[PDB]
Amino acid sequence: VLSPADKTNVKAAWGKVGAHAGEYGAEALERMFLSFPTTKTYFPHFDLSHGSAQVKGHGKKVADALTNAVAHVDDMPNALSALSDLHAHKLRVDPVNFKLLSHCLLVTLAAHLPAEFTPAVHASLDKFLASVSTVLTSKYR
Amino acid sequence: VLSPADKTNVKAAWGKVGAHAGEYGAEALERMFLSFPTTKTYFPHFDLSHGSAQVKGHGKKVADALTNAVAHVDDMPNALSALSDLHAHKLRVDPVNFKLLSHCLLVTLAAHLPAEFTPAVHASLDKFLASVSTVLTSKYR
Amino acid sequence: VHLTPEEKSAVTALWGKVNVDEVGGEALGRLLVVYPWTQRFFESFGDLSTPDAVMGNPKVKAHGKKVLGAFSDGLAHLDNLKGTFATLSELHCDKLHVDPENFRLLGNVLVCVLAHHFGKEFTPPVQAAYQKVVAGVANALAHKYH
Amino acid sequence: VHLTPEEKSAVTALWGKVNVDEVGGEALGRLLVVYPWTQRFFESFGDLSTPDAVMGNPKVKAHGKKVLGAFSDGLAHLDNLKGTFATLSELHCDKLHVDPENFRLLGNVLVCVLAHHFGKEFTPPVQAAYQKVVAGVANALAHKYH
Numbered sequence: 001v002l003s004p005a006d007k008t009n010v011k012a013a014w015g016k017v018g019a020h021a022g023e024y025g026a027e028a029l030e031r032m033f034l035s036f037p038t039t040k041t042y043f044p045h046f047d048l049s050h051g052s053a054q055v056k057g058h059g060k061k062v063a064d065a066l067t068n069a070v071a072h073v074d075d076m077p078n079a080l081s082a083l084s085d086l087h088a089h090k091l092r093v094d095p096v097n098f099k100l101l102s103h104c105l106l107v108t109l110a111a112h113l114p115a116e117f118t119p120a121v122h123a124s125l126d127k128f129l130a131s132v133s134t135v136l137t138s139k140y141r
Numbered sequence: 142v143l144s145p146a147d148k149t150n151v152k153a154a155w156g157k158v159g160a161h162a163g164e165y166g167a168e169a170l171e172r173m174f175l176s177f178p179t180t181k182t183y184f185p186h187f188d189l190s191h192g193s194a195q196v197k198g199h200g201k202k203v204a205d206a207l208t209n210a211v212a213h214v215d216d217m218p219n220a221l222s223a224l225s226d227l228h229a230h231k232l233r234v235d236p237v238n239f240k241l242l243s244h245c246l247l248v249t250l251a252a253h254l255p256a257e258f259t260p261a262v263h264a265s266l267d268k269f270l271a272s273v274s275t276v277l278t279s280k281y282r
Numbered sequence: 283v284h285l286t287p288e289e290k291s292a293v294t295a296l297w298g299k300v301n302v303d304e305v306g307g308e309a310l311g312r313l314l315v316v317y318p319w320t321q322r323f324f325e326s327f328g329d330l331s332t333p334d335a336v337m338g339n340p341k342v343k344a345h346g347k348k349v350l351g352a353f354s355d356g357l358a359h360l361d362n363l364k365g366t367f368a369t370l371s372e373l374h375c376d377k378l379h380v381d382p383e384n385f386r387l388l389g390n391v392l393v394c395v396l397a398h399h400f401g402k403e404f405t406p407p408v409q410a411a412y413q414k415v416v417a418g419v420a421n422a423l424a425h426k427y428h
Numbered sequence: 429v430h431l432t433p434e435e436k437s438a439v440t441a442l443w444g445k446v447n448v449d450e451v452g453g454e455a456l457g458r459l460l461v462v463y464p465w466t467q468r469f470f471e472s473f474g475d476l477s478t479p480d481a482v483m484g485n486p487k488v489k490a491h492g493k494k495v496l497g498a499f500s501d502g503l504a505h506l507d508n509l510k511g512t513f514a515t516l517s518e519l520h521c522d523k524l525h526v527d528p529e530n531f532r533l534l535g536n537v538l539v540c541v542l543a544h545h546f547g548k549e550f551t552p553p554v555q556a557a558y559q560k561v562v563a564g565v566a567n568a569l570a571h572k573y574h
């Protein structure tokens with residue numbers, strides 16, 4: 001459950017990503033596939049080599065989905081319903097993988113936006129990514 | 142994220158508890174303290190011996206809070222705000238303990254209401270107790 | 283896993299009454315229904331689209347019987363779970379890529395099934411002893427992850 | 429924990445540049461702020477009521493330095509983590525009753541702090557090597573709970 005301060009922190013921190021969206025999303029995926037190789041088993045059809053156009057395109061889609069979640073932070077089950085049907089019903093992603101990607105996104109933000117990644121902002125982003133993760137792994141339609 | 146079917150399944154199974162609320166709540170606590178002794182460290186001031194009046198009284202409070210959560214299933218952050226104040230801000234209960242009590246509640250329901258404890262109902266009760274757990278362990282004031 | 287002589291006696295007596303044709307399949311079926319992402323590991327079983335389809339699926343029942351056999355094996359080797367299960371842990375970790383949190387989930391679903399079958403006979407002390415057993419089994423299945 | 433000669437070299441080179449006065453306290457402070465229930469274990473440190481109060485607390489900074497020392501001890505004994513952390517595992521299990529999931533959380537917070545300090549130099553291959561290290565440390569700390 002996000003606090004009002006959590007929502008302000010998430011809107012401000014994720015707002016600093018802006019046009020870097022795709023780059024941060026692609027780097028988080030790259031970090032995930034290298035650090036936790038079992039995550040690669042969900043993407044057998046992807047070219048996963050460094051500078052892969054497919055990972056770059058996917059990174060943009062993931063980051064744009066998070067931007068959409070921020071734009072509907074009080075109505076995420078409704079706003080993310082199609083993504084939930086994809087990850088929960090179709091792909092059957094184990095919830096552990098969402099913890100891994102969420103962690104890799106935080107690492108990416110810490111490395112490239114250090115002034116924004118304060119302890120309070122880190123706590124708010126962790127809660128936001130955990131809330132998005134529960135929505136994407138739940139069957140509620 | 143609870144589905145509309147989840148909400149009705151929870152209303153139907155928990156509705157069969159009724160006057161046996163305190164007894165199921167007390168048994169779930171008893172099961173928890175015996176199976177996972179570290180949970181006793183949150184209750185140093187309690188008499189935790191078998192048939193303890195304190196555990197029985199506490200069991201009724203826990204079960205009545207769940208009945209209230211069922212009655213406000215779409216507005217749990219607001220309805221359970223005082224319980225989040227207590228568990229998240231004051232007692233600082235580690236979220237693992239909520240998984241343990243939730244499991245002990247499911248065991249109690251399986252043992253005493255077998256006709257109610259179908260796989261569909263078991264799935265709905267697990268999701269409901271996980272949602273209640275996140276509310277009680279979150280700081281959202 | 284350390285069980286008291288009283289716990290060993292209670293665990294053994296209840297285990298001898300377990301319906302070996304049903305309990306495993308019911309634990310596996312409930313895992314698939316309650317934690318739906320676990321279905322990804324069992325695509326070869328066919329139809330798992332509804333709770334009734336899962337529970338009545340013959341592949342779920344046959345595989346569940348094998349899983350129950352492995353918990354039975356655990357109960358017979360409580361002093362050497364890591365050794366006994368070494369090759370089983372290798373299969374789950376290296377070949378199947380099953381995240382270890384799922385082993386804890388299956389152990390707890392099995393406890394729910396035992397409570398469902400035994401009612402008031404699955405007492406809080408009997409449950410406490412079974413929790414030590416299923417935690418031991420889960421830790422042994424996760425041990426080859428490092 | 430198995431690290432390649434390349435990973436060993438990258439881990440050692442970055443570790444030698446770690447600010448020993450700050451990194452541990454920042455990892456511990458962030459654990460307390462990001463996972464607030466962890467504060468229950470540190471009531472003797474006094475004021476932890478705000479993020480600024482946590483991060484500037486001298487007990488958090490001094491204890492964080494000891495935690496960093498223990499991760500460093502892990503790096504010095506990668507082939508024998510369970511042996512190295514045996515007494516620390518018993519302390520966190522038997523005396524402190526810290527649930528083992530919290531060890532994984534601290535390891536990952538430390539990785540976030542290393543990324544925060546090193547920026548683009550904390551590359552995806554450097555991170556991957558550190559993930560093996562912190563997972564190894566977390567597993568070794570949890571080993572006496574079984």
Ligand code: HEM
Binds near residue numbers: 039043065066098133
């Ligand atoms: C913050 C968490 C996540 C978000 C916001 C997210 C978002 C997305 C989006 C927007 C798509 C594209 C859907 C489309 O094509 O219309 C997608 C696809 C997919 N996601 Fe996720 N995802 C997340 C986590 C995960 C994780 C943890 C995994 C597995 C490790 C995963 C596996 C997939 C796969 C396999 C696809 C299909 C890719 C393809 O064939 O093109 N996702 N995700």
Ligand code: HEM
Binds near residue numbers: 184224227238242
């Ligand atoms: C479904 C989950 C839970 C519910 C609905 C719940 C509900 C409650 C309620 C209604 C009270 C009484 C508040 C009052 O006196 O006005 C309470 C007190 C308390 N709860 Fe929980 N609780 C839950 C889980 C837990 C867990 C997992 C723990 C720790 C293992 C815990 C520890 C406590 C403690 C220590 C108190 C204070 C008892 C006293 O001094 O009287 N609770 N809880």
Ligand code: HEM
Binds near residue numbers: 353419
């Ligand atoms: C923690 C308790 C568990 C026990 C005792 C257990 C036991 C077993 C046993 C005895 C086998 C048969 C081995 C063989 O003959 O080659 C097996 C196979 C397997 N297990 Fe487990 N298992 C456990 C948990 C899990 C979980 C949680 C999953 C997935 C979520 C899983 C997925 C599988 C799969 C996919 C196979 C191969 C089935 C096939 O042949 O198609 N197991 N398990």
Ligand code: HEM
Binds near residue numbers: 516532
């Ligand atoms: C996984 C990495 C961890 C490492 C390497 C670690 C390391 C240490 C070390 C070296 C000590 C000092 C022991 C002594 O003075 O004899 C210590 C103490 C302690 N640790 Fe940890 N720890 C870890 C995780 C945790 C976590 C997650 C918690 C709580 C959530 C925790 C709570 C404590 C507490 C309460 C003490 C005693 C502090 C005091 O003296 O009042 N530790 N830890």
Ligand SMILES: C[C@H](Oc1cc2cc(C(N)=O)ccc2nc1N)c1cc(F)ccc1-n1cccn1
Binds near residue numbers: 002003216219272
């Ligand atoms: C609008 C939202 O509604 C709910 C959020 C829930 C979250 C969980 C959960 N598990 O995080 C479980 C039940 C919920 N029920 C709601 N009504 C809400 C209401 C509130 F009073 C405070 C914060 C939020 N919030 C916005 C984003 C995240 N939380």
Ligand SMILES: C[C@H](Oc1cc2cc(C(N)=O)ccc2nc1N)c1cc(F)ccc1-n1cccn1
Binds near residue numbers: 272
């Ligand atoms: C009213 C509630 O609102 C939210 C629930 C949230 C849960 C999470 C979560 N992490 O489970 C994250 C964000 C949420 N935001 C909400 N607005 C809701 C809305 C919906 F469309 C479907 C189900 C529920 N629901 C009722 C009980 C539990 N879920």
